[PDB]
Structure formats: C-alpha cells, structure tokens
C-alpha cells in the first residue's frame, strides 16, 4: 500500500477572496468616451456573442440528462437533505479527506467534484452528505460576533473640521492613514512605502481619540477599534489568540485601519481575572510585536495606537518598522483653547454677557476634554433652568463642577 499524493501544492485555501469570479472582464482603457474605448467594448461584445452562440449550441445538442438545470438538480440529489455540518480535519488527497462531525467522530470520506476544492483548508466548516458523510460543500462561515465587535459599522460624525489646533498632528496622521489610500501615486513615485505605524501620545483629553474618530470619518478602509485593556483575557494564551484574530480580521477586510486605543492600559492595569500575571501580558505583547512587524506578510493594514502613558510601553513595541511615527498631542495653547471653545459652542446659543476669553484661562492645564465638559455641563445647567440661552453664570457653575469637586 502507498499513501495518496495530492496534486495541489500546500494545504491552505486560495488567498484571493471575494473576487469578480467569471465576470472579470478585461479593463478597457481609456475611460474617456473615445472610439478606441468603443472599439475595445465592441471586441468584448463580439467575443461574448461568439461565446453565447457556442454555449447555446452545445446545450442544444447536449442530452436531456446533461442540462444546466438538470445538472443542478442532480447536484442537489447527490448532496441530499439534510446536509450535515462537519469540520475539515485533514485533506488526505484531492478527492479524499478526513472530516469530523459535530459528535466528535471522524470519517475518511470522499470530496465530490462539485465541491469548491480551493475553499478547503483544515478546520474549515464543510457540508457532508447525511448518509455517506462525503464532502458535498463548504459552508461560508458567518461573521464572528467578535468581527462585528471590532468593525466600526457607521463612520463617526466627528470630522477634521471639528478638531482645533492639531494641524501638525492631523497632517502627520493623514500622511500615514489617509494619503496612502487616496493618493498612493505620491508614495509610488517617491519609491517609499508609507510610514508603517502611528502612535498618538499625550496628556489625557488632548484629542488622540478625537483624531482617530476624524480619521475613521474620512477613511475608505475598514476601521477596527480595540481598547488595550480588552487584550487582557481571563485564560492563558487567550490574549495572544485575541491579538492574532484581531489582525487576521484586519487582513480579511483589507484595506483596514487598526486602532489600538489606550494600549498602555494592557500593562498599567492588573486584574485578578488574568490567570497569568505580568508574564501572560508579556506574551500578549510579544504576539502584538509579531503582528505589527513579524514573519507573516502584512497586507494593507494600518495600525494607530493611542496612550497617555507612553513611558510605560515596551520600547520594542513602538520601535520603527512597527510604529514609524510618534505624534505628540500637547495641552492646548490659548489660540487652540479659543478654537476649541468656538468649536464646542458653535451649535450653542450663547448669551451676550458670556465671553470665551475669560473661560480660556479657567485652568492652566486646560485640555479639549475639559472645555467640552465645561460646555456640556453649562448646557445642562441651562436645561435645569428650562433655558435655551446659556448665561455666564451657567459657565461659572460649569467650571466649579467639572474642574473641581
């Protein structure tokens, strides 16, 4: 006896996912409505006419058994009903595989011809005949709930115009997560790949997450948001597993932007639910190191990290190649404070006795979050008195509310 030899190279499925399939018509150039585009379109049309006539003839003199609807009905009969859902454990041969049913019992069954053999990889969910357990299909796995958790379905309403004073920071982040997608020709003509990673660091409330929201508003790439503390799991190896799956999902929806917000919180916070102590956190960090810049080839995945404690991060995590740009978000100056106050009171109906110049120096260490909280709480005080116009007394109470106590 000799073991079977597969004809397919490797054991993994085809990398390409969600293509145009048989509708991959040749890209006709130029897009301008000229006679050359017209001639190329006519040529495609003549080839389609010839194809249509040939296929019609062949199906015309094909036997009654061999017809498209008849062959589909025969495929349905071969599959039968119900179609059990098992797990592809191993691909023994091109048309033979070991599959395990839901009851944990394995079977050496045959893969039928109509199965999409390039969709078969170990661990993939397959559909088997109920009686003979032969592989009759591959089940398109439904989106994981975790896939839904990361993905930002609706773009945030905060735009770059809602950010005041962070001109240089906006430029630096646009050069790394927005310009490479909108205008890749700059980078291609310059002969450089775009800056790989970006980390936004600064005191709390300075606008790091606001800039990430603005990026997510004006991005054509899938946006995945993960808090650093979410990477701390309750079981050993579950942290590295979560990081690995997060970047796998990022690779699936390429191009994508991975926003690991509050990354330092993975290390600055210790929870007793974490079975492993600092060592499991270190293993999770090593997995993150591999994902950021490691052996596996990375697609069109951009990583944005934010933290108010960058001194607590492992320096190998933010090393160049993993995080190329380190964008600092300083506490706003007077011009930026005035811009922030005008931004957050733009929809407000301020009173004539309210001046933003006095509020500009409510505290020396005033941030954008403090200003927004001042405005929101002043509006709340106006709401308490059943008013739509916010008075200077409302802002005065706001300052003693949010900043103090």
């Amino acid at each position: 006896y000799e073991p079977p030899v597969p004809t397919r190279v490797g054991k993994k499925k085809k990398k390409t996912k969600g293509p145009d399939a048989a509708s991959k018509l040749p890209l006709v150039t130029p897009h301008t409505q000229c006679r050359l585009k017209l001639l190329k379109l006519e040529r495609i049309k003549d080839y389609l006419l010839m194809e249509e006539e040939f296929i019609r003839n062949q199906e015309q003199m094909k036997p009654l058994e061999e017809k498209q609807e008849e062959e589909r009905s025969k495929v349905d009969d071969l599959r039968g009903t119900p179609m059990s859902v098992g797990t592809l454990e191993e691909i023994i041969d091109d048309n033979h595989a070991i599959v395990s049913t839901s009851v944990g019992s394995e079977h050496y069954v045959s893969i039928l011809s109509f199965v999409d053999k390039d969709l078969l990889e170990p661990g993939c969910s397959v559909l088997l005949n109920h009686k003979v357990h032969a592989v009759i299909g591959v089940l398109m796995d439904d989106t994981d709930p975790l896939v839904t958790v990361m993905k930002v379905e609706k773009a945030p309403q905060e735009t770059y115009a809602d950010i005041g004073g962070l001109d240089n920071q906006i430029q630096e982040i646009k050069e790394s997560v927005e310009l490479p997608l909108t205008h890749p020709e700059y980078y291609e003509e310059m002969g450089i790949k775009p800056p790989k990673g970006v980390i936004l660091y600064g005191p709390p409330g300075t606008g790091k997450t606001l800039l990430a929201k603005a990026v997510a508003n004006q991005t054509s790439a899938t946006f995945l948001r993960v808090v650093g503390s979410e990477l701390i799991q309750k079981y050993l190896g579950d942290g590295p597993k979560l990081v690995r799956e997060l970047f796998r999902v990022a690779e699936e929806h390429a191009p994508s932007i991975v926003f690991i917000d509050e990354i330092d919180a993975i290390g600055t916070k210790r929870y007793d639910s974490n079975s492993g102590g600092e060592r499991e956190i270190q293993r999770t960090m090593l997995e993150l190191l591999n994902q950021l810049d490691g052996f596996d080839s990375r697609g069109d995945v951009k990583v944005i990290m934010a933290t108010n404690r960058i001194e607590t991060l492992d320096p190998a995590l933010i090393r160049p190649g993993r995080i190329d740009r380190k964008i600092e978000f300083p506490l706003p100056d007077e011009k930026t404070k005035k811009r922030i106050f005008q931004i957050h009171t733009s929809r407000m109906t301020l009173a004539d006795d309210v001046t933003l110049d006095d509020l500009i120096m409510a505290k020396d260490d005033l941030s954008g979050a403090d200003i927004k909280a001042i405005c929101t709480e002043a509006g709340l005080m106006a709401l308490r008195e059943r008013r739509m116009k916010v008075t200077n007394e409302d802002f005065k109470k706001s300052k003693e509310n949010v900043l103090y106590k």
Partner: protein
C-alpha cells in the same frame, strides 16, 4: 438560429347517422329521420331499439351488406 451578427460583418347542428346507428339514450329524444326519406318508423323514433320501417315507395331495396365477425 443562425450565427450572431458581429461588429464587423362552424360545427353543424345535426349529424346523419347511418344504419345501424349508435344512438345514445339521450340522443333518442333528439333524433328524427329526414321527412323526405322513403322509410317511416312505426313507433316513435325516440323509443329506440329495433324499429321496423314502413316503405312509402317500391323502388330497388338498397339494403345493408352484413359484415363478418373478427
């Protein structure tokens, strides 16, 4: 179809039934021989069955040739 053209390139209201006539039980009430025929039935033609026919004329007798059993 040829090659694709490329870019360049009045029931009647009565019926005469012969003799013998396969007549329905319902047909009897609606069946009556033509008036001008040389034969006239003894019983009403709606009765059915074997009917003797009075002969008005004494011309040649155009009888019915018997058929042979299968």
């Amino acid at each position: 179809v040829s090659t694709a053209v490329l870019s360049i390139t009045p029931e009647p209201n009565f019926q005469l039934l012969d003799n013998p006539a396969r007549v329905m039980p319902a047909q009897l009430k609606v069946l009556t021989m033509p008036e001008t025929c040389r034969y006239q039935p003894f019983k009403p033609l709606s009765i059915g069955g074997i009917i003797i026919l009075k002969d008005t004329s004494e011309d040649i007798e155009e009888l019915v040739e018997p058929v042979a059993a299968h």
